[PDB]
């Protein structure tokens, strides 16, 4: 199993595309397996994952862990990878293992890295403008009002990509309602008409007046650019996005704080911290060689190689002393590890059709964040949920 492999990739942005290419360079060197990467625009790759897997997919592919893995593993679209994990199993922890498995208990994913969803800011700006890190909702709101009166956009905000605003719902839910409630909702074991969801949208109505206007017309990269260019005070997203988008020259000025506490019952106990990894499509060619590349991917060595170029994510291997780490990465390890539990992200944690319904409903909330809209959102979400989860 040394013959050439094909690798489908959603790393279409410059910085993560380059990081992946560097991993494949090293993967070919050590395994001997020639690899040809086929890249597709990020969103359209996940938007067409079904036809992709059912058609003539590549030997291996970039994908996501948790429910977003299970949903397509359940369809028989993926080759199980228990043989690979027999070799690499000792390298990963229980949390990474359960995220890597289908509903059937079998492995389908090799994971590579983790990252946090947190509020990013520029240290020099907080310093020079006398902004203090906010521990609580009230302090957060006060700070955003101070930014506003300073002539700044308080929170840079983008939702043209559809998924980014799901992160705000997640974190509001996790802060107000907690983790167990959030996963219930994702599994539709609690309805979208539930008063806890109303509370989420109600909190968001206060937050919305400090979020960048025109957000439904904005790519997340342009939001991250406004932060990096100091036109905005902070931005809530994943480090995989914001810190990958920063110049390497500017990255040392980047820092974050976890989303402030709202409800003392849940403090800052929880966050979204997505794991990314790789699958082996059932209809891909050369599975023998592909597993050899996967076995390599699932090592500390490979994660270290990878993190010489990726400076924004955090490796998952147990022994990992990949000493490249900057301050963003170190704080990521610590703050993630502090959480009692970590969810993935809405579109990774629920049925894709349900996430797609929410993506649109939340865009419509962004444009008209009134109690009227919130009522329609809950009823529409709950109606579509009853169909999807039947
Ligand atoms: O950070 C969370 C996001 O991660 C992205 O890479 C993915 O395209 C989104 O669908 C969402 O899961």
CSV table of N, CA, C and O in Angstrom, one decimal, residues 53-146:
chain,number,residue,atom,x,y,z
A,53,UNK,N,-19.3,12.4,-1.3
A,53,UNK,CA,-19.0,11.1,-0.7
A,53,UNK,C,-19.6,10.0,-1.6
A,53,UNK,O,-19.2,8.8,-1.6
A,54,UNK,N,-20.8,10.3,-2.2
A,54,UNK,CA,-21.5,9.3,-3.0
A,54,UNK,C,-21.1,9.2,-4.4
A,54,UNK,O,-21.4,8.2,-5.1
A,55,UNK,N,-20.2,10.1,-4.8
A,55,UNK,CA,-19.8,10.2,-6.2
A,55,UNK,C,-18.5,9.5,-6.4
A,55,UNK,O,-18.4,8.2,-6.4
A,56,UNK,N,-17.4,10.2,-6.6
A,56,UNK,CA,-16.1,9.7,-6.7
A,56,UNK,C,-15.1,10.5,-5.9
A,56,UNK,O,-14.3,11.3,-6.4
A,57,UNK,N,-15.2,10.3,-4.6
A,57,UNK,CA,-14.4,11.1,-3.7
A,57,UNK,C,-12.9,10.7,-3.7
A,57,UNK,O,-12.5,9.7,-4.2
A,58,UNK,N,-12.1,11.5,-3.0
A,58,UNK,CA,-10.7,11.3,-2.9
A,58,UNK,C,-10.4,10.2,-1.9
A,58,UNK,O,-11.2,9.7,-1.2
A,59,UNK,N,-9.1,9.8,-1.8
A,59,UNK,CA,-8.7,8.6,-1.1
A,59,UNK,C,-8.9,8.9,0.4
A,59,UNK,O,-9.2,8.1,1.2
A,60,UNK,N,-8.7,10.2,0.8
A,60,UNK,CA,-8.8,10.7,2.2
A,60,UNK,C,-9.5,12.1,2.0
A,60,UNK,O,-9.4,12.7,1.0
A,61,UNK,N,-10.1,12.5,3.1
A,61,UNK,CA,-10.7,13.9,3.1
A,61,UNK,C,-10.6,14.5,4.4
A,61,UNK,O,-10.7,13.9,5.5
A,62,UNK,N,-10.5,15.9,4.4
A,62,UNK,CA,-10.7,16.7,5.5
A,62,UNK,C,-12.2,16.6,6.0
A,62,UNK,O,-13.1,16.7,5.2
A,63,UNK,N,-12.4,16.5,7.3
A,63,UNK,CA,-13.7,16.6,7.8
A,63,UNK,C,-13.7,16.9,9.3
A,63,UNK,O,-12.7,17.3,9.9
A,64,UNK,N,-14.9,16.8,10.0
A,64,UNK,CA,-15.1,17.3,11.3
A,64,UNK,C,-15.5,16.1,12.3
A,64,UNK,O,-16.0,15.1,11.8
A,65,UNK,N,-15.3,16.3,13.6
A,65,UNK,CA,-15.6,15.3,14.5
A,65,UNK,C,-17.0,15.4,15.1
A,65,UNK,O,-17.7,16.3,14.8
A,66,UNK,N,-17.3,14.5,16.0
A,66,UNK,CA,-18.6,14.6,16.8
A,66,UNK,C,-19.7,14.2,15.9
A,66,UNK,O,-19.6,13.4,15.0
A,67,UNK,N,-20.9,14.8,16.1
A,67,UNK,CA,-22.0,14.4,15.4
A,67,UNK,C,-21.9,14.6,13.9
A,67,UNK,O,-22.4,13.8,13.1
A,68,UNK,N,-21.2,15.6,13.5
A,68,UNK,CA,-21.0,15.9,12.0
A,68,UNK,C,-20.2,14.8,11.3
A,68,UNK,O,-20.5,14.5,10.2
A,69,UNK,N,-19.4,14.0,12.1
A,69,UNK,CA,-18.9,12.7,11.6
A,69,UNK,C,-19.9,11.6,11.6
A,69,UNK,O,-20.1,10.9,10.6
A,70,UNK,N,-20.5,11.4,12.8
A,70,UNK,CA,-21.5,10.3,12.9
A,70,UNK,C,-22.5,10.2,11.9
A,70,UNK,O,-22.9,9.2,11.4
A,71,UNK,N,-23.1,11.4,11.5
A,71,UNK,CA,-24.3,11.5,10.7
A,71,UNK,C,-24.0,10.9,9.3
A,71,UNK,O,-24.9,10.2,8.7
A,72,UNK,N,-22.8,11.0,8.8
A,72,UNK,CA,-22.4,10.5,7.5
A,72,UNK,C,-21.8,9.1,7.6
A,72,UNK,O,-21.9,8.3,6.7
A,73,UNK,N,-21.1,8.8,8.8
A,73,UNK,CA,-20.7,7.5,9.1
A,73,UNK,C,-21.9,6.5,9.1
A,73,UNK,O,-21.8,5.4,8.6
A,74,UNK,N,-23.0,7.0,9.7
A,74,UNK,CA,-24.2,6.2,9.8
A,74,UNK,C,-24.8,5.8,8.4
A,74,UNK,O,-25.6,4.8,8.3
A,75,UNK,N,-24.4,6.5,7.4
A,75,UNK,CA,-24.9,6.3,6.0
A,75,UNK,C,-24.1,5.3,5.2
A,75,UNK,O,-24.5,4.9,4.1
A,76,UNK,N,-23.0,4.8,5.8
A,76,UNK,CA,-22.1,3.8,5.2
A,76,UNK,C,-21.2,4.5,4.1
A,76,UNK,O,-20.7,3.8,3.3
A,77,UNK,N,-21.0,5.8,4.3
A,77,UNK,CA,-20.3,6.6,3.3
A,77,UNK,C,-18.8,6.5,3.6
A,77,UNK,O,-17.9,7.0,2.8
A,78,UNK,N,-18.4,6.0,4.8
A,78,UNK,CA,-17.1,6.1,5.3
A,78,UNK,C,-16.5,4.7,5.6
A,78,UNK,O,-17.3,3.8,5.9
A,79,UNK,N,-15.2,4.5,5.4
A,79,UNK,CA,-14.6,3.3,5.8
A,79,UNK,C,-14.1,3.4,7.2
A,79,UNK,O,-13.5,4.3,7.7
A,80,UNK,N,-14.5,2.3,8.0
A,80,UNK,CA,-14.1,2.3,9.4
A,80,UNK,C,-12.6,2.1,9.5
A,80,UNK,O,-11.9,1.5,8.6
A,81,UNK,N,-12.0,2.6,10.6
A,81,UNK,CA,-10.5,2.8,10.7
A,81,UNK,C,-9.9,2.3,12.0
A,81,UNK,O,-8.9,2.7,12.5
A,82,UNK,N,-10.6,1.3,12.6
A,82,UNK,CA,-10.1,0.6,13.8
A,82,UNK,C,-8.7,0.0,13.7
A,82,UNK,O,-8.0,0.0,14.7
A,83,UNK,N,-8.4,-0.5,12.5
A,83,UNK,CA,-7.0,-0.9,12.3
A,83,UNK,C,-6.0,0.2,12.5
A,83,UNK,O,-4.9,0.0,13.1
A,84,UNK,N,-6.3,1.4,12.0
A,84,UNK,CA,-5.4,2.5,12.1
A,84,UNK,C,-5.2,2.9,13.6
A,84,UNK,O,-4.1,3.1,14.1
A,85,UNK,N,-6.3,2.9,14.3
A,85,UNK,CA,-6.4,3.2,15.7
A,85,UNK,C,-5.7,2.2,16.6
A,85,UNK,O,-5.3,2.5,17.8
A,86,UNK,N,-5.6,1.0,16.2
A,86,UNK,CA,-4.8,-0.1,16.9
A,86,UNK,C,-3.4,0.4,17.0
A,86,UNK,O,-2.7,0.1,18.0
A,87,UNK,N,-2.9,1.1,16.0
A,87,UNK,CA,-1.5,1.6,16.1
A,87,UNK,C,-1.4,3.0,16.9
A,87,UNK,O,-0.6,3.2,17.7
A,88,UNK,N,-2.4,3.9,16.6
A,88,UNK,CA,-2.3,5.2,17.1
A,88,UNK,C,-3.1,5.5,18.4
A,88,UNK,O,-3.0,6.6,18.9
A,89,UNK,N,-3.8,4.5,18.8
A,89,UNK,CA,-4.7,4.6,19.9
A,89,UNK,C,-4.1,5.2,21.2
A,89,UNK,O,-4.7,6.0,21.9
A,90,UNK,N,-2.9,4.8,21.5
A,90,UNK,CA,-2.2,5.2,22.8
A,90,UNK,C,-1.9,6.7,22.8
A,90,UNK,O,-1.6,7.3,23.9
A,91,UNK,N,-1.9,7.4,21.7
A,91,UNK,CA,-1.5,8.7,21.5
A,91,UNK,C,-2.6,9.8,21.9
A,91,UNK,O,-2.3,10.9,22.1
A,92,UNK,N,-3.9,9.3,22.0
A,92,UNK,CA,-5.0,10.3,22.1
A,92,UNK,C,-5.8,10.0,23.4
A,92,UNK,O,-5.8,8.9,23.9
A,93,UNK,N,-6.5,11.0,23.9
A,93,UNK,CA,-7.3,10.9,25.1
A,93,UNK,C,-8.7,10.5,24.9
A,93,UNK,O,-9.2,10.5,23.7
A,94,UNK,N,-9.4,10.1,26.0
A,94,UNK,CA,-10.8,9.6,25.9
A,94,UNK,C,-11.7,10.5,25.1
A,94,UNK,O,-12.5,10.1,24.3
A,95,UNK,N,-11.6,11.8,25.4
A,95,UNK,CA,-12.5,12.8,24.7
A,95,UNK,C,-12.2,12.8,23.2
A,95,UNK,O,-13.2,12.9,22.4
A,96,UNK,N,-11.0,12.8,22.8
A,96,UNK,CA,-10.6,12.7,21.3
A,96,UNK,C,-11.1,11.4,20.7
A,96,UNK,O,-11.5,11.4,19.5
A,97,UNK,N,-11.2,10.4,21.5
A,97,UNK,CA,-11.6,9.1,21.0
A,97,UNK,C,-13.1,9.0,20.7
A,97,UNK,O,-13.5,8.5,19.7
A,98,UNK,N,-13.9,9.5,21.7
A,98,UNK,CA,-15.3,9.4,21.5
A,98,UNK,C,-15.8,10.3,20.3
A,98,UNK,O,-16.7,10.0,19.6
A,99,UNK,N,-15.1,11.5,20.1
A,99,UNK,CA,-15.3,12.4,19.0
A,99,UNK,C,-15.0,11.7,17.6
A,99,UNK,O,-15.3,12.3,16.6
A,100,UNK,N,-14.2,10.7,17.7
A,100,UNK,CA,-13.6,10.1,16.4
A,100,UNK,C,-14.4,8.8,16.0
A,100,UNK,O,-14.1,8.3,14.9
A,101,UNK,N,-15.5,8.5,16.7
A,101,UNK,CA,-16.2,7.3,16.5
A,101,UNK,C,-17.5,7.5,15.9
A,101,UNK,O,-18.1,8.6,16.1
A,102,UNK,N,-18.1,6.6,15.1
A,102,UNK,CA,-19.5,6.6,14.7
A,102,UNK,C,-20.4,6.2,15.9
A,102,UNK,O,-19.9,5.8,17.0
A,103,UNK,N,-21.7,6.2,15.6
A,103,UNK,CA,-22.7,5.7,16.6
A,103,UNK,C,-22.5,4.2,16.9
A,103,UNK,O,-22.8,3.7,18.0
A,104,UNK,N,-21.9,3.5,15.9
A,104,UNK,CA,-21.7,2.1,15.9
A,104,UNK,C,-20.5,1.7,16.8
A,104,UNK,O,-20.1,0.6,16.9
A,105,UNK,N,-19.8,2.7,17.3
A,105,UNK,CA,-18.6,2.5,18.2
A,105,UNK,C,-17.3,2.4,17.5
A,105,UNK,O,-16.3,2.2,18.1
A,106,UNK,N,-17.4,2.4,16.1
A,106,UNK,CA,-16.2,2.2,15.3
A,106,UNK,C,-15.5,3.5,15.1
A,106,UNK,O,-16.2,4.5,15.0
A,107,UNK,N,-14.2,3.5,14.9
A,107,UNK,CA,-13.5,4.7,14.5
A,107,UNK,C,-13.7,5.1,13.0
A,107,UNK,O,-13.6,4.2,12.2
A,108,UNK,N,-13.9,6.3,12.7
A,108,UNK,CA,-14.0,6.8,11.3
A,108,UNK,C,-13.1,8.0,11.1
A,108,UNK,O,-13.0,8.5,9.9
A,109,UNK,N,-12.5,8.6,12.1
A,109,UNK,CA,-11.8,9.9,12.0
A,109,UNK,C,-10.4,9.7,12.7
A,109,UNK,O,-10.2,9.2,13.7
A,110,UNK,N,-9.4,10.3,12.0
A,110,UNK,CA,-8.1,10.7,12.7
A,110,UNK,C,-8.1,12.2,13.0
A,110,UNK,O,-8.1,12.9,12.0
A,111,UNK,N,-8.1,12.6,14.2
A,111,UNK,CA,-8.0,14.0,14.6
A,111,UNK,C,-6.6,14.5,14.6
A,111,UNK,O,-5.6,13.8,14.6
A,112,UNK,N,-6.5,15.9,14.4
A,112,UNK,CA,-5.2,16.5,14.3
A,112,UNK,C,-5.0,17.6,15.4
A,112,UNK,O,-4.0,17.8,16.0
A,113,UNK,N,-6.1,18.4,15.6
A,113,UNK,CA,-6.0,19.6,16.4
A,113,UNK,C,-7.3,20.1,16.9
A,113,UNK,O,-8.4,19.8,16.3
A,114,UNK,N,-7.3,21.0,17.9
A,114,UNK,CA,-8.4,21.5,18.6
A,114,UNK,C,-8.3,23.0,18.5
A,114,UNK,O,-7.2,23.5,18.2
A,115,UNK,N,-9.4,23.7,18.8
A,115,UNK,CA,-9.3,25.2,19.0
A,115,UNK,C,-10.5,25.8,19.7
A,115,UNK,O,-11.6,25.3,19.6
A,116,UNK,N,-10.3,27.0,20.3
A,116,UNK,CA,-11.3,27.6,21.2
A,116,UNK,C,-12.2,28.7,20.5
A,116,UNK,O,-11.7,29.3,19.6
A,117,UNK,N,-13.4,28.8,20.9
A,117,UNK,CA,-14.3,29.9,20.5
A,117,UNK,C,-14.3,30.9,21.7
A,117,UNK,O,-14.9,30.7,22.8
A,118,UNK,N,-13.7,32.1,21.5
A,118,UNK,CA,-13.4,33.0,22.6
A,118,UNK,C,-13.3,34.4,22.0
A,118,UNK,O,-13.3,34.6,20.7
A,119,UNK,N,-13.3,35.4,22.8
A,119,UNK,CA,-13.3,36.8,22.4
A,119,UNK,C,-11.9,37.3,22.2
A,119,UNK,O,-11.1,37.5,23.1
A,120,UNK,N,-11.6,37.7,20.9
A,120,UNK,CA,-10.2,38.1,20.6
A,120,UNK,C,-10.1,39.7,20.7
A,120,UNK,O,-11.1,40.4,20.5
A,121,UNK,N,-8.9,40.1,21.0
A,121,UNK,CA,-8.6,41.6,21.0
A,121,UNK,C,-7.1,41.8,20.8
A,121,UNK,O,-6.3,40.9,20.9
A,122,UNK,N,-6.7,43.1,20.6
A,122,UNK,CA,-5.3,43.5,20.5
A,122,UNK,C,-4.8,44.0,21.8
A,122,UNK,O,-5.4,45.0,22.4
A,123,UNK,N,-3.8,43.4,22.4
A,123,UNK,CA,-3.3,43.8,23.7
A,123,UNK,C,-2.9,45.3,23.7
A,123,UNK,O,-3.2,46.0,24.7
A,124,UNK,N,-2.3,45.8,22.6
A,124,UNK,CA,-1.8,47.2,22.6
A,124,UNK,C,-3.0,48.2,22.7
A,124,UNK,O,-2.8,49.3,23.3
A,125,UNK,N,-4.1,47.8,22.1
A,125,UNK,CA,-5.3,48.7,22.1
A,125,UNK,C,-5.9,48.7,23.5
A,125,UNK,O,-6.2,49.8,24.0
A,126,UNK,N,-6.1,47.6,24.2
A,126,UNK,CA,-6.6,47.5,25.5
A,126,UNK,C,-5.7,48.3,26.4
A,126,UNK,O,-6.2,49.2,27.2
A,127,UNK,N,-4.4,48.0,26.3
A,127,UNK,CA,-3.4,48.8,27.1
A,127,UNK,C,-3.5,50.3,26.9
A,127,UNK,O,-3.8,51.0,27.8
A,128,UNK,N,-3.4,50.7,25.6
A,128,UNK,CA,-3.3,52.2,25.4
A,128,UNK,C,-4.6,52.9,25.6
A,128,UNK,O,-4.6,54.1,26.0
A,129,UNK,N,-5.7,52.2,25.5
A,129,UNK,CA,-7.1,52.8,25.6
A,129,UNK,C,-7.6,52.6,27.0
A,129,UNK,O,-8.7,53.0,27.3
A,130,UNK,N,-6.9,51.8,27.8
A,130,UNK,CA,-7.3,51.6,29.2
A,130,UNK,C,-8.6,50.7,29.3
A,130,UNK,O,-9.4,50.9,30.2
A,131,UNK,N,-8.7,49.7,28.4
A,131,UNK,CA,-9.7,48.7,28.5
A,131,UNK,C,-9.3,47.6,29.4
A,131,UNK,O,-8.2,47.1,29.3
A,132,UNK,N,-10.3,47.1,30.2
A,132,UNK,CA,-10.0,46.0,31.1
A,132,UNK,C,-10.7,44.8,30.6
A,132,UNK,O,-11.8,44.9,30.1
A,133,UNK,N,-10.1,43.6,30.8
A,133,UNK,CA,-10.7,42.4,30.4
A,133,UNK,C,-12.0,42.2,31.2
A,133,UNK,O,-12.0,42.3,32.4
A,134,UNK,N,-13.2,41.9,30.6
A,134,UNK,CA,-14.4,41.8,31.3
A,134,UNK,C,-14.7,40.3,31.7
A,134,UNK,O,-14.6,39.4,30.9
A,135,UNK,N,-14.9,40.1,33.0
A,135,UNK,CA,-15.2,38.8,33.6
A,135,UNK,C,-16.7,38.5,33.5
A,135,UNK,O,-17.1,37.3,33.5
A,136,UNK,N,-17.5,39.5,33.4
A,136,UNK,CA,-19.0,39.3,33.4
A,136,UNK,C,-19.7,40.0,32.3
A,136,UNK,O,-19.2,40.9,31.7
A,137,UNK,N,-21.0,39.6,32.1
A,137,UNK,CA,-21.9,40.2,31.1
A,137,UNK,C,-21.9,41.8,31.3
A,137,UNK,O,-21.8,42.5,30.3
A,138,UNK,N,-22.2,42.2,32.5
A,138,UNK,CA,-22.4,43.6,32.7
A,138,UNK,C,-21.1,44.4,32.4
A,138,UNK,O,-21.2,45.5,31.8
A,139,UNK,N,-19.9,43.9,32.8
A,139,UNK,CA,-18.7,44.5,32.5
A,139,UNK,C,-18.4,44.4,30.9
A,139,UNK,O,-17.8,45.4,30.4
A,140,UNK,N,-18.8,43.4,30.3
A,140,UNK,CA,-18.6,43.2,28.8
A,140,UNK,C,-19.4,44.3,28.1
A,140,UNK,O,-18.9,45.0,27.2
A,141,UNK,N,-20.7,44.5,28.5
A,141,UNK,CA,-21.5,45.5,27.9
A,141,UNK,C,-21.0,46.9,28.2
A,141,UNK,O,-21.0,47.7,27.3
A,142,UNK,N,-20.5,47.1,29.4
A,142,UNK,CA,-19.9,48.4,29.7
A,142,UNK,C,-18.7,48.7,28.8
A,142,UNK,O,-18.5,49.9,28.4
A,143,UNK,N,-17.9,47.7,28.6
A,143,UNK,CA,-16.7,47.9,27.7
A,143,UNK,C,-17.1,48.2,26.3
A,143,UNK,O,-16.4,48.9,25.6
A,144,UNK,N,-18.1,47.5,25.8
A,144,UNK,CA,-18.5,47.7,24.4
A,144,UNK,C,-19.1,49.1,24.3
A,144,UNK,O,-18.9,49.7,23.2
A,145,UNK,N,-19.7,49.6,25.3
A,145,UNK,CA,-20.3,51.0,25.3
A,145,UNK,C,-19.1,52.0,25.3
A,145,UNK,O,-19.2,53.1,24.7
A,146,UNK,N,-18.1,51.7,26.0
A,146,UNK,CA,-16.9,52.5,26.1
A,146,UNK,C,-16.2,52.6,24.7
A,146,UNK,O,-15.8,53.6,24.2
